[model samples]
Target chain A: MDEGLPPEEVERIRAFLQERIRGRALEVHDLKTRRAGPRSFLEFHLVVRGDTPVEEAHRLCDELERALAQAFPGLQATIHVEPEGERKR
Target chain B: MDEGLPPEEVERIRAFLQERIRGRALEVHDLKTRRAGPRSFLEFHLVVRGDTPVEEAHRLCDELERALAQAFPGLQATIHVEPEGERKR
Candidate 1:
């Protein structure tokens, strides 16, 4: 299998997303990498288990983005989700 | 709007991803943030400008993953694509 994230980091981020939705983030994906300019960055995809309104999702993203930037100052983190209560997946 | 990532950093990663697809990665999304355990992470969404077979897409993802891991060992990067050929916006 292709070795992506180390087991620890995977578990680490997994817990992070889960906590955001009260441990209801069913799944997450390690999307892609980018070298925006000076730094290289990574992306994550999430499968959430709750109904997240557009406003609420945006708020969550904003708050989460700050925390991520502060916590992982070197590497930036972003997410996309199939919100908890939505018709589309 | 959300004060997600810094402008310079965004430019930096944008350049990086565009360079990978020969400057055809038209748009990219800063998805969500996650805190699995010790570390936190971000996710990215991409829109490319050419035809990308599933095999080719996966290969690109793999190569890109390695490059990202090597370039930013601390932060892991992964990707999801609307490929090039098939279609989705």
Candidate 2:
């Protein structure tokens, strides 16, 4: 299967996430996509509130995953969470 | 900037993950990667033991994230977990 998503699809995903993630996350980055068989995969890193609980973060991930599937059928999504103040370094 | 990881880099990442993820996950899928500035972001979904604790899942995610960074400097990773019996459908 082709390994990458098209530019327009990427833009659509970026916009969809930005709209849904308002107030729920501090920022989202590292968005990536790929195509395999009948499914398209979407994955991104989300930075959330510093005080958010694991339960809350997991809920957010689930919410986005469902949203992405609904917005784009055959889309599978996984969101990775990081607390607001954590440093990548 | 170009948005996708090269095929060889992707292969290297796949091998790295398959090696480190031994026994820790039932399977890994939806592996994706992208480039942004100085950092390369990787995201993948893992199916883990049905009885695994949330704490253990989080620990696994952190361990893989750090290991990816170490194996490929400037690499950032996020892993999303699903229990063994959970179906994506």
Candidate 3:
């Protein structure tokens, strides 16, 4: 991805993620971002520890999507939080 | 940056972040990734708490970089961990 934008702009995106979600228990892992083809794509992968139900996890995803949209205008994001093996187990 | 890779490969990167750094207090913020121009770049930002000293932080960065390189071959990573206001203060 060609980051036509200045380096400072890219730093701003990093700051946004730090301010909003880092160190929060709801997010049990590092937030990873990837950009490609002149466009930036953001994906937040969250793992809920303890015994949270799948329905609640989906609800959290909705909340995160809304929050991220508000934080990053014109940016695209997809939030996924589910049990590790629910699909294939 | 263009991923040019399968979706599953991308997921592996995400998992690496989670398994390696998530829920670790040494990391005070989310790990953000951005890719552009057909290359994948990884950066890890860590904030040490409770007065660990800067030298120790650097050592930790060294350990992390080594671990990451071993975990994901052919991947390049830059790790940054410094006091938030040390630069301009």
Candidate 4:
């Protein structure tokens, strides 16, 4: 997310998120693009339904990171996905 | 920021910041436009140099809010400005 990339590329990222995640019932909040040093960082607070296994959540986060990197070369990202419920007693 | 506004209007705000605030060496960081309900909220982490009096900062913030409201009809904003240093000895 360096400033050198054309603004259109950033718009593409927003479009990608809206299209890919819509209607999935995923509660994604505070999704933001922040420019730090030489990179534009996309950070969000996400919450999903039910009790998804930790392994599955990690896989999904990795998948999202890979998708963005593939779509825009040199773009860097980190996605943290957390589950909806508490640990069982 | 409502989704209905044209995208170009959003870009204008960014450009305004870059041009107006760049030369003064004011450190403005983490600026972002957020959408909630029918409005787009712009929030940022900003650090300014020296001890600006609180009243002065409040006046400046009010001026900024008024200027923005004038520039973009229906736009809403709230600016919180804090001093640079710790409480006096």
lDDT of 4 by residue, B18-89 (tens): 564454325444445655455565544333333443333334445566767777566665432322331123
List CA RMSD, all candidates.
12.1, 7.1, 15.1, 14.7
Q: Kindly list the per-residue Cα lDDT of model 3 for residues B14-52, writing each as its tens digit.
A: 566556655443442334444444545565446444344
Whole-model lDDT, model 2: 0.76
Tell me the number of clashing residue pairs for each predicted model.
Answer: 34, 0, 18, 3
Point out the worst 10-residue segment of candidate 4 chain A by lDDT: A80-89
- Label model 2 with its docking quality class: incorrect
Q: What value does DockQ give for candidate 1?
A: 0.06
Model 3 TM-score on a 0 to 1 scale: 0.35
Best prediction by DockQ:
2
Model 2 chain B, TM? 0.86
Q: Candidate 2's residue-wise lDDT over B23-70, tens digit each?
A: 877777767788767888887877776456545666678888888999
Which of 1 and 2 is the better model by TM-score?
A: 2
Judged by DockQ cut-offs, is candidate 4 incorrect, acceptable, medium or high? incorrect
Ranking by DockQ: 2, 1, 3, 4
For candidate 3, give the DockQ: 0.03
1 against 4, candidate with superior DockQ = 1
**Which of the two candidates, 2 or 4, achieves a greater lDDT against the reference?**
2
lDDT of 2 by residue, A1-89 (tens): 24559978988998999899899877778777887678898777777764565556666788898999999998998777666554244
Better of 1 and 3 by DockQ: 1
Using TM-score, give the best candidate's number.
2
